[PDB]
Design a protein around this ligand. Sequence first.
Ligand SMILES: *[C@@H]1O[C@H](CO[C@@H]2O[C@@H](C)[C@@H](O)[C@@H](O)[C@@H]2O)[C@@H](O[C@@H]2O[C@H](CO)[C@@H](O)[C@H](O)[C@H]2NC(C)=O)[C@H](O)[C@H]1NC(C)=O
Ligand SMILES: *[C@@H]1O[C@H](CO[C@@H]2O[C@@H](C)[C@@H](O)[C@@H](O)[C@@H]2O)[C@@H](O[C@@H]2O[C@H](CO)[C@@H](O)[C@H](O)[C@H]2NC(C)=O)[C@H](O)[C@H]1NC(C)=O
Lengths: 218, 97
Amino acid sequence: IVGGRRARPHAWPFMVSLQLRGGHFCGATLIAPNFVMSAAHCVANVNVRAVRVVLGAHNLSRREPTRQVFAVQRIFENGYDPVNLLNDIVILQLNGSATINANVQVAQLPAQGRRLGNGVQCLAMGWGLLGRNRGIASVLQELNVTVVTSLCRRSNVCTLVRGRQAGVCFGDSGSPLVCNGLIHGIASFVRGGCASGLYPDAFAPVAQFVNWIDSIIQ
Amino acid sequence: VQVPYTITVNGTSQNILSNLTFNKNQNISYKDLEGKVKSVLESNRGITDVDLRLSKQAKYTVNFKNGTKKVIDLKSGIYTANLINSSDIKSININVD
Ligand SMILES: *[C@@H]1O[C@H](CO[C@@H]2O[C@@H](C)[C@@H](O)[C@@H](O)[C@@H]2O)[C@@H](O[C@@H]2O[C@H](CO)[C@@H](O)[C@H](O)[C@H]2NC(C)=O)[C@H](O)[C@H]1NC(C)=O
Ligand SMILES: *[C@@H]1O[C@H](CO[C@@H]2O[C@@H](C)[C@@H](O)[C@@H](O)[C@@H]2O)[C@@H](O[C@@H]2O[C@H](CO)[C@@H](O)[C@H](O)[C@H]2NC(C)=O)[C@H](O)[C@H]1NC(C)=O
C-alpha cells in the first residue's frame, strides 16, 4: 500500500497474510472459520503445499502470539483466465478451523450481483510494498480509495485516489477491498506501475462470485 | 541461484545458452522481473527499451517448478500485485517479434 497509514492493531480481524519461506507474498480474507479467499494468480504458480495461512497478524516483523497458522488443504477456482486476468479469485480450505476471537473474525460478503457505483468510498489494505521502491510493510496498512468506472472494466472493481500517487503495490494481491463494511474486492493488478495516479487499481469483483462462494463454504 | 533463460528475436534467435542470478527464497515482483528481462535483452542483444516499444510483439514466459508457466506481455504495462519466490522459477524464455 503506497500512501496509506498504519491500521490500528487488529482493526481488520479478517485480514490474512499468505506466506512462503521468504515471508508474506499475498493477502487474503477469512470468509468462514476454515476458508480464506484470495486472488487465483497468488497461488497459480506456487506450491500450495508450502503456503502458510497466517491469521490474526498485525506486525509481520514481530513474533505475535495472537497469530493462528494453518496449511492449505484444498483450493477451489472458478474459471480463472490468467491471460485476461478474469475471475481472479481462489478459495483456500484450511487444515482446520480458526478460533474466532477479538483478533480473528470472519468477513461479511455482499449480495450476489451488487455493483458499486462511481464515487463509492472504500478502504484498501495490505502488507504490500510501501512505495514503488522500498520493501513490504511491517504493520498492516490501510488506504481510503474511491470506486471509479472510467479506465476500468465491467469485469473488475476499480479504485483511484484523486490527485495523489497512492494505491496498492506488490504483495497486496489477494487483499480485501472493504466498502460499507463488506468485502467487495480482491486486489488483482495495477497498470503502469504502483500508484501511478492515472490508472485505477483493479480488484476482482467479489459480488459477482457470491453464489459460487456460498456453494463452497455452505 | 542460477536461472537459465533464452532469447528469441524474430523467431531466429536461440543460439545462446546462459543464466540469470537470483537470491535464494527472496520474494520479487513482476516489475523486478521485467527489469531483469530488459537488462539481459540489452546486454546480450543490444535490444533497448526503445527497441522493445518499436517491436511488433515482446513477451517473456516464466516457467515454474510446479510445472506451470506465466506469459507476460512486455508491452501491456499490466502487473499482477503479487510477490513471487525467486526459488520457484525454473527458467525464462524471452521472445521479441
Ligand atoms: C495444520 O497445519 C499447520 C501448519 O503446518 C505447517 O505449515 C504447512 C504449510 C506445512 O509446511 C506443514 O508441514 C507445517 O507443519 C500445523 O501447524 C504446525 O503444527 C505442528 C504441530 O502442532 C507444529 O510443530 C508447527 O510449528 C506448526 N507450524 C506452524 C507454521 O504453525 C497444524 O498442526 C496443522 N493442524 C493439524 C490439526 O494438524
Ligand atoms: C476513510 O475511511 C474510513 C473507514 O470507513 C470506510 O468508509 C466507509 C464509507 C465504508 O466504505 C467503510 O466500509 C470503510 O471502512 C472512514 O471512517 C468513517 O468515518 C465516518 C465519519 O467520520 C464515521 O461515521 C464512520 O464510523 C467511520 N468508520 C470507520 C470504520 O472508521 C473515514 O471517514 C474515511 N476518511 C475520509 C477522509 O474519507
